[PDB]
Design a protein around this ligand. Structure first.
Ligand SMILES: [Cl-]
Length: 129
């Protein structure tokens, strides 16, 4: 499904992402906007044979196993199919692991290039959280 901005903000806050590992909620909402345009079903194929899945575009080479990616490490220990659900729990749980591995939100290029450096709290402005 396609989430609305405040709708996603509320779901992410309920899932403990606000200020997780030092990243305020706005960062996560901004990343999702530019990574998948708030669509839980977005997929992107990469040159290395990997694919990015879901609202947070989680990669199959390191994080989830999709069964067609060479050198897959499955660090979140979940099939990539689970990250295409309308429910964001699995994606969020994996996202928490990705940010904890020691490089914060730099794993997400859309966040890195289009969110970082801007006023990200503007992404949750107007929402009841
Ligand atoms: Cl899969």
């Amino acid at each position: 499904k396609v989430f609305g901005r405040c709708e996603l903000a509320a779901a992410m806050k309920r899932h403990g992402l606000d200020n997780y590992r030092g990243y305020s909620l706005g960062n996560w909402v901004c990343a999702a906007k530019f990574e998948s345009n708030f669509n839980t079903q977005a997929t992107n194929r990469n040159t290395d044979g990997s694919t990015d899945y879901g609202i947070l575009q989680i990669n199959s080479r390191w994080w989830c196993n999709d069964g067609r990616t060479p050198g897959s490490r499955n660090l979140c220990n979940i099939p990539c199919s689970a990250l295409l659900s309308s429910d964001i729990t699995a994606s969020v749980n994996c996202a928490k692991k990705i940010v904890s591995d020691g490089n914060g939100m730099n794993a997400w290029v859309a966040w890195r290039n289009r969110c970082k450096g801007t006023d990200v709290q503007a992404w949750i402005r107007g929402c009841r959280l």
